[PDB]
Amino acid sequence: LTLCRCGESLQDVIDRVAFVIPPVVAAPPSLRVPRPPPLYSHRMRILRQGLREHAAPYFQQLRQTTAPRLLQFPELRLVQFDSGKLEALAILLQKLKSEGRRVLILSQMILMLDILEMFLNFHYLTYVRIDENASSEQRQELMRSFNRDRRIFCAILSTHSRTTGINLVEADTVVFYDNDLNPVMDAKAQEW
Amino acid sequence: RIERIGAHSHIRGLGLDDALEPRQASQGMVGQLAARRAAGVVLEMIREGKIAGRAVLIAGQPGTGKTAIAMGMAQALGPDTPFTAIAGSEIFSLEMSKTEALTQAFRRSIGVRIKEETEIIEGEVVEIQIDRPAKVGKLTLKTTEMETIYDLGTKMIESLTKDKVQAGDVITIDKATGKISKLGRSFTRARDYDAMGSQTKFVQCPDGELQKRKEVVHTVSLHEIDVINSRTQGFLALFSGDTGEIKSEVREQINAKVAEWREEGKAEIIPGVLFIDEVHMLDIESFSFLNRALESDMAPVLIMATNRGITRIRGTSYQSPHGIPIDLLDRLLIVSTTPYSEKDTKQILRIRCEEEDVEMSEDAYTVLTRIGLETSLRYAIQLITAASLVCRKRKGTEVQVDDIKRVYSLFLDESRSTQYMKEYQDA
Amino acid sequence: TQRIASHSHVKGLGLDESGLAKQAASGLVGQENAREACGVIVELIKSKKMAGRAVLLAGPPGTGKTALALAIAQELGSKVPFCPMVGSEVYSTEIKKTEVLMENFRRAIGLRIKETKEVYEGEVTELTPCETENPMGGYGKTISHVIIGLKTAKGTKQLKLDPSIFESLQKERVEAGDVIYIEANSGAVKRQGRCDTYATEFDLEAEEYVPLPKGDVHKKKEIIQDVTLHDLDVANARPQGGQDILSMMGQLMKPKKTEITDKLRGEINKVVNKYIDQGIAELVPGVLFVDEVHMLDIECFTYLHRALESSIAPIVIFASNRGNCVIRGTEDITSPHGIPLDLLDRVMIIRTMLYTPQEMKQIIKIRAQTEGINISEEALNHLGEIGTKTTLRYSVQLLTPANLLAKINGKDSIEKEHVEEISELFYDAKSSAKI
Amino acid sequence: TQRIASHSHVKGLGLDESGLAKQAASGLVGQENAREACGVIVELIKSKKMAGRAVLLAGPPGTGKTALALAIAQELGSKVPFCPMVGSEVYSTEIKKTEVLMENFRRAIGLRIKETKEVYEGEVTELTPSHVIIGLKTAKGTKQLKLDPSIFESLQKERVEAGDVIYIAVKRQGRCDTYATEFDLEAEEYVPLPKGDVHKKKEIIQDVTLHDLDVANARPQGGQDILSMMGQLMKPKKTEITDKLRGEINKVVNKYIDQGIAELVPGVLFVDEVHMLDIECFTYLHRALESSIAPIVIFASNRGNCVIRGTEDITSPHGIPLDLLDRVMIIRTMLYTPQEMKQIIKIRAQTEGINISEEALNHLGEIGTKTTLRYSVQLLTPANLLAKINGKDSIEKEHVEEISELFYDAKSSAKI
Amino acid sequence: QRIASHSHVKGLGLDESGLAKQAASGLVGQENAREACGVIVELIKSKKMAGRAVLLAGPPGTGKTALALAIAQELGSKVPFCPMVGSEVYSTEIKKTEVLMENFRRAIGLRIKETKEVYEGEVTELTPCEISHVIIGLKTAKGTKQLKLDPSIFESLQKERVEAGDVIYIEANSGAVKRQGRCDTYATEFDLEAEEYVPLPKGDVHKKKEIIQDVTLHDLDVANARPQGGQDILSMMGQLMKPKKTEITDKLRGEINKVVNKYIDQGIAELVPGVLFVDEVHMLDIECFTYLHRALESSIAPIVIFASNRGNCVIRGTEDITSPHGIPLDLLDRVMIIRTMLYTPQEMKQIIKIRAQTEGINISEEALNHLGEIGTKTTLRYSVQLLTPANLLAKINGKDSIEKEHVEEISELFYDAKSSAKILAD
Ligand SMILES: Nc1ncnc2c1ncn2[C@@H]1O[C@H](COP(=O)(O)OP(=O)(O)O)[C@@H](O)[C@H]1O
Ligand SMILES: Nc1ncnc2c1ncn2[C@@H]1O[C@H](COP(=O)(O)OP(=O)(O)O)[C@@H](O)[C@H]1O
Ligand SMILES: Nc1ncnc2c1ncn2[C@@H]1O[C@H](COP(=O)(O)OP(=O)(O)O)[C@@H](O)[C@H]1O
Ligand SMILES: Nc1ncnc2c1ncn2[C@@H]1O[C@H](COP(=O)(O)OP(=O)(O)O)[C@@H](O)[C@H]1O
After folding, report:
1. Cα–Cα–Cα angle for B1, C286, C393, rounded to 5 degrees
2. Residue numbers of B between 241 and 300 with CB closer than 8 Å to D
3. Do residues E160 and E177 touch, judged by C-beta distance below 8 A?
4. Domains present along chain B, CATH in parentheses
5. Are C195 and C283 members of one domain?
6. Which domain does D378 fall in, by range?
7. Which residue ranges of B are tagged as binding site for ATP?
8. Is B in contact with E (3 or more beta carbon pairs below 8 Å)?
9. Strand boundaries in C217-335, DSSP class E
10. Do C83 and C2 fall within a single domain?
11. Measured between beta carbons, which residues in chain C are less than 8 angstroms from residue A3?
12. Based on the domain organization, do D156 and D212 belong to the same domain?
């Protein structure tokens, strides 16, 4: 029969085991290895025969080998929870998608662009990022791919490039995530 | 639905008022206003959970309702809060030390409600056209207010092939992992196949096409340590008691990550209760451990019951009240249960009869209350059952005096057993 | 092989329709009040309304406590389970005492689980009636239905099954002429094997040819399986299916009987209730006869008088033979019947008086009858007299040896001389005490 | 909020610049000589020069020896490990008792090691194979790594579009590449392309204890040979041998130290309830304390002259034999006075979040000096709940009176 | 040689007529116990009786263990002799009765007579034909030939990584192993391969010799207590409990006895019952004595020698029953008791001189007298222990032999049980 393995009402056991895995081994080393400068042929042959015998039943595969855990990466939730700006952005994007309007996210730091990328991936919102690294023609190609493609929801810009290549707008919704208050940057930014 | 009424089934909560004022008879309890008010206030403290490591000792003569008030508190606490009931002799395991069993029992009555944001797409599969090469596929989900077609990927197509999903099936696909979860069907299957007959489930939510922030609160106890001690944990979480895991890197690390989750809003701690019935059976080492284990922040509320006065502590020679060392006994506060009077006994017997669905005359109630005040209460309930059975056999409607008096001679009490025991059967 | 046991004459409490007691009570004689109490408690059990109730069969040795216990057990019938246990069995070196007690309690509880499955079988004649391509799309070649010509011993019946099953058909070697095991709802095909009609004597192969099915193609097989709750506990305890469990060294130690309360209670109880209220199973609480209860440690009684408090605990029939004795595991703590005074308050004591010499004679005679050996009046009187002198169980043991002595001496019936000779060849402990 | 504990009110010894024990500070109150001795002990610990020393905080019940040791731990800091232990913890059914105490001594010691880990991250562009020439692509550039066969992945780990992060000794399939536009609905979830360079070395200053390395080298779980997986397949256990305990471990730790790779961090081991240990534990502690590698141990005994467990024949002071009781310094804590009792009650009420009136505080102090201080401490919360139910924000004398009437102390229950 | 406590005991010291000499073969005095030992040793050599028991009872330091070692030496290594101690029975993974039965089985030995022959051959000549028939070449330092083998041997050979120019041993009945190199691997100048090479073997290509392997029934039991390896059942890892909990007697030990009797009737095996010397018998529990007095009654039990140092006392596990020699009257009876008497001062001095001669220490006349006096004062063992440091100090001081000064100084330096107890009253 099927059991819950815990106090929760109903949930997939796989999800149960995957949710709660805080601890990783403190300091697991490799196995010990005797080092006799001479290695007698008898013992080495016996060990090779044993290894061959143990490798023969490979049809099991040990079900992924159940290898230990040694990384414990941080949860993706923390990307949003770490900043209220990202929670407000999540609420705004959910509202706009319920309304069907695309969104144009504007940020100043490329690291903030990567943060926004991870955030949208946490929210599964398809996006197209246009930054300074991409050449003018590459920026125009990215903007063309964003345009006429209703499957792309968000567009992320750096606000530091010229951005004179953009031609058409999709939903007429912009979100100024960051404010610079710089002499020339903000002016031309808001202008275009 | 088929679960027989036990010895503590008559009680179904701790009768209390808005101001915590105890009542004469309510929720299956009778009399004992002091201990019942103590139970109510300790239950309020439990449901508060602001303080950790509090202990209460329920003392009194046998038959005073210690286990009764314990089960009443357990019931009044209700679900969503763990209540680990255990006997003093259960900590003695041949695969785990006493201290380890006590740690397991303590961490077992502590819960963490883990919040998880989910994004599930649901609807009616109008078209599941899949092009198998032996790669391409499209799913047409339909709702009561909108429709949408989704181009399926190779892995998604394979997953759909795993869990057979025919047209008209109500499914809830998780956009995070793509797990196929079928809930039912919206209509029959062509009315022509001479097989596969079932019932039709209601239509899906109108906005079921894409649920954005479906919040599911996964509740799990701090016994999750079993998930880490070994690569294969189900064996330990289900049957295997040989869980002598390493205390370091497991207890401390799990507690640290639980604190991190509480600080980051992922989960919230809900301390439960640990009820050790007949705690006097614990060895002095177990009491010494409870002395220190009761000081941790994750310590649940430790409710204990003792049916003795001055008695020797197991594992030593010297005696202490309630069989508990002076240290732990002084740490906790004791709730004494006063014996029940004749009226309370009669009312408890009547409540039990109502629970057993048995009826008896007034003279029967009187004589049975007399017998119970003389011998005991539990013996009075045994006589209730025996007389009800004798009446059923006699084809009567209610139990009269002639049935209780008959079963009184048919079944003997320990007081009369020891009297007839003068035949020196053995020693 | 009849293999007559020690005391098999007991067949039931033998109570009259009114519930009173009689002499010829289906093998067991005497013990009127005790047999009436046994009838009351067996009526209770049959009612299946109360749980966690215990009864104590206190009485001096030789009163036939185990006899009346087996009598009430037989009266209950093989329908409800009856798990006999002795206090010594609780002492286990691999599993704690309280968990053994809980496992025994679970065993005492029964559960009948029904299972009805509509399955179709018979020799297959596969054929796909060509149908126009999907009318919603373009043209081409499709299959809207797949007809399978299941032929059974009674006749033939073609089934126009769903076309999606065609994958299963091709998966297994389902060729025209073999027996397939179809499932109504699931639809999965499980080929049983070719028909024996094609099993030519010159073809060397086994497990591949099976006889034709007898009966209609559509068969609604109704099967009932009675398994105690402990069986389900054990089944859900250990794993099955891959996971490198085939190892010998690190896995052959199957005795992991250690069990936790979370799995025992909780999920198992909930699924049992779901099967009950849904109509898939019927709960059948049995009885747990625990003889030599005085042999249990105080750590066992302290858990018993807590498990009996549970609503799921079954009926327990304790049978203590000792008198006032120190509780095991305690420091000179004398209590009646070797049981703590706290547990005796939760058990109904059924007192059993000593058998009257006439009852001794009746028991000896009925045991001789069960054994199948005739005994003369004088021999029976001497047996009764010696059973009155010493323990009664000594006399019943003098029947078979006296019977063999008589048969070897050339006579059939057991004469007084035979029992007299056996009493000198074999004697009891009371006489052996003369060291 | 964080739920209150029994000793969450103590924040430290609260001593002056010269060690003078103030009447009340840092949550503690009274016990000036004891807190000065504890200041000297924490100075010893910070010295990191002596090894194997120990102290016994023997005193009457309720004096706060446990709270005192916890305040000591807090004052020392989180860096230096502080391992709490109960006397009953030594009794185990799978590991030898003296060996339990040994592993406790070991875990009590800390070790801060520095290591540089090379991490390989990026979307897998090529996965052609023993040695596998994998191709990782990132925002910076692409590199064809000549990775070893031991890292060859068994699970899906798609040859293309799979985001993988590897470090030298296991691989983690972070997520699928950002191809969310290729399909409208796919089971796989996506993450953005890693912006960091493929090959990067980051120095992590990880803090671990010596017992971690001990138990890890005892039953390692690394490597890839099938024999390893079969060994660690089931039934982990304990009882590391002494040859592996000492010897290789100490040598490698000293190597890391003298080479600047690691830094030793001596810790503390608080063996509470030492009064109920067997004579074998004491006989092993004799040689444990007499070791140049044993850490500082703080004992907290409560019994007086009683029979030592395991012998049930001979009695010794504090339930500890004289030969051992002399090896450990004695800290004599005195009982609190009614004034100090009321002061600590007020401190706990302030920490516990309970407002108590003057008359209520006086009644609590009276009940404390009469029955027990900890009894009144326990009665604190019930009185607050009673006040809440009655609608009173602050506790009054009547509330504590009713509470005491409901709950009977141990002494009163014994009188009955 | 690392002289031990019982090295000078190289025999029992009986003459041709059977009487015990006053001092010979390292033993001194104790004529009655030596005669009993020389009688029981002949009893053992008879190989006809079974389960007969002996008890070397006597005060401490009387040489009961010395007499046991003398019996063992006189018997010779051709028969098993299991030195056993009572404390050894208290095993944690095997029950005491089972450990005792395993020791009893070890005390029985059998010699397996077999004539094995080899078919060493060259691998370079490997030329199979049909996988159904294979031929291998023979090239040794004394001859060259060729053999014809069953394809099963070819399979077992190719299983090994054979290479041209290797020396392979092929047994006529079963088995095969590889020896790499025959003065050709180092010739090509290719580096090592984690293994050592060997030149071509001398002698004829086909060799035959008589084999006699001394194996005991316990070895057979241990070998049959496992799957023997081979297929996937060969799974073997660390912590394997080779000394398994127990092994049934009727279906496992009985089969071993049956096969041994069969091979003995066939003349292939020869039984040689040994001796089981259980020292410190008083340490065994009463539940051990009760099974011991019954197991030694079986038709297969070997001769068991006992030695109880302490006299009458409470039996182990009883705490109330007291019997002489710490052995219950049940087991005490049926066991031939050999009383050992105390040594006289002259016998003590003679034993001291023999110990000095054996260990190489040289003592003077007055030194020997003083050492014997110190011995008879407290015990002979104290003098035996002081003998070594006396010569050690003598060497340190530049003296070759021991003198009165050195012995007196070393006696004053150290202390004995009597002296220690005398000063322990402080
Ligand atoms: N207040 C009460 N109301 C109803 N039944 C009670 C009460 N107190 C005791 N009993 C009955 O007395 C018997 C034993 O008392 P219990 O409730 O276990 O208290 P204790 O633990 O002191 O024995 C039980 O069968 C229980 O039903
Ligand atoms: N009333 C009876 N009628 C016939 N035989 C009886 C009766 N009572 C006891 N016996 C006999 O007594 C023997 C054992 O009785 P048992 O149930 O073991 O009592 P106890 O366990 O107290 O010794 C049985 O073999 C049975 O034949
Ligand atoms: N010096 C102190 N200052 C403040 N509170 C104290 C002090 N000493 C003890 N306490 C209090 O007394 C209670 C019990 O002290 P504890 O450490 O358990 O004493 P012991 O160590 O003797 O058991 C603690 O909850 C703590 O609040
Ligand atoms: N007959 C003897 N001749 C010479 N040396 C002896 C003789 N008997 C005993 N010894 C010596 O005395 C010592 C006594 O040792 P041991 O036999 O163990 O004494 P016990 O009689 O207590 O077993 C032995 O080391 C042995 O060398």
Report:
1. 165
2. 242, 244, 246-249, 259, 262, 269, 271, 284-286, 288-289, 291-297, 299
3. yes
4. 6-110+221-340 (3.40.50.300), 341-427 (1.10.8.60)
5. no
6. 336-416
7. 60-67
8. no
9. 218-226, 281-285, 287-291, 315-319, 325-326, 334-335
10. yes
11. 236, 263, 267-268, 271
12. yes
* Residue pair C121/C181 in contact by the 8 Å Cβ criterion: yes
Q: Are C306 and C300 spatial neighbours (Cβ–Cβ below 8 Å)? A: no
| Ligand 2 closest atom vs CA C69 | 17
CA of E419 to the centre of ligand 4 (A): 22
Task: Indicate yes or no: CB of C271 within 8 angstroms of CB of A60.
Answer: no
Q: Which of B11, B12, B58, B66 to mutate to test the pocket of ligand 1 (most atoms within 8 A of CB)?
A: B66
Q: Spell out the residues 6+ positions from residue D197 whose beta carbon is closer than 8 angstroms to its own.
A: D138, D140, D141
Is residue B215 within 8 A of residue B115, CB to CB? The reply is: yes
User: What's the CATH code of the domain at C348?
Assistant: 3.40.50.300
Q: Do chains B and A touch (3 or more CB pairs under 8 A)?
A: yes
Q: Are residues E183 and E196 in the same domain?
A: yes
Q: What residues of D are designated binding site for ATP?
A: 59-66
Q: Does C103 lie in the same domain as C241?
A: yes
Of E306, E321, E342, the one marking the end of a domain is: E342
Q: Which ligand is nearest to the CA of B60?
A: 1
C120 and C228 fall within a common domain: yes
Radius of gyration of chain E measured on its C-alpha atoms: 29
Q: Whose CA is nearest to atom 8 of ligand 3?
A: D64
> Helix E64-75 vs helix E31-46: angle between axes, to the nearest 10 degrees?
40
**What is the C-alpha to C-alpha distance for residues C187 and C184, in angstroms, rounded to an integer?**
6
Closest ligand to C11 CA?
2
Q: Give phi and psi for B104, each to the nearest 5.
A: -60, -45
Chain C residues whose CB is inside 8 A of the D226 CB are none
Ligand 4 midpoint to CA E343 (Å): 10
Resolution (A): 9.4
Distance from CA of A117 to the nearest CA of B (A): 16
* Domain of residue C184, CATH code: 2.40.50.360
Q: How many helices (H) and strands (E) does chain E have?
A: 13, 17
| Residue spans of alpha helices (H) in D83-186 | 97-108
Write the single-letter amino acid at B129. Answer: Q
- In the reported structure, the alpha carbon of residue C10 is separated from the centroid of ligand 2 by a whole-number distance in angstroms of 9
Q: Look at strands B136-142 and B147-152 and give their pairing.
A: antiparallel
Query: What is the rounded distance in angstroms from the CA atom of residue D315 to the CA atom of residue D281?
Result: 16
Total number of domains in chain E: 3
E174 burial via Cβ count (<10 Å: 0-12, 13-18, 19+): exposed
Instruction: Say if residues E98 and E191 touch (Cβ distance below 8 Å).
Output: no
CATH number where D414 lies: 1.10.8.60
D with E: how many residue pairs have Cβ under 8 Å apart? 5
How deeply is A137 buried, as exposed, middle or buried, from its count of CB atoms within 10 A (0-12, 13-18, 19+)?
exposed
Closest chain A residue by Cα to residue B255: A22
CA distance E413 to E406: 10
**Residues C274 and C135 grouped into a single domain:** no
B292, B293, B296, B298 alpha-carbon torsion, rounded to 10°: -170
3-state secondary structure of D307: strand
Last residue of a domain, one of E195, E223, E251: E223
Q: Give yes or no: residues E328 and E359 share one domain.
A: no
Query: Mutate which of D102, D413, D415, D416 to disrupt the B interface (most B C-beta within 10 Å)?
Result: D413
Ligand 4: residue of E3, E32, E64 to mutate (most ligand atoms within 8 A of CB) is E64
Query: From ligand 4's centre to the CA of E54, what distance in Å?
Result: 18
Q: Which of E271, E361, E281 is nearest to E315 (CA)?
A: E281
Q: Which of E93, E231, E232, E235 is the best substitution to test chain C (most C C-beta atoms within 10 A)?
A: E235
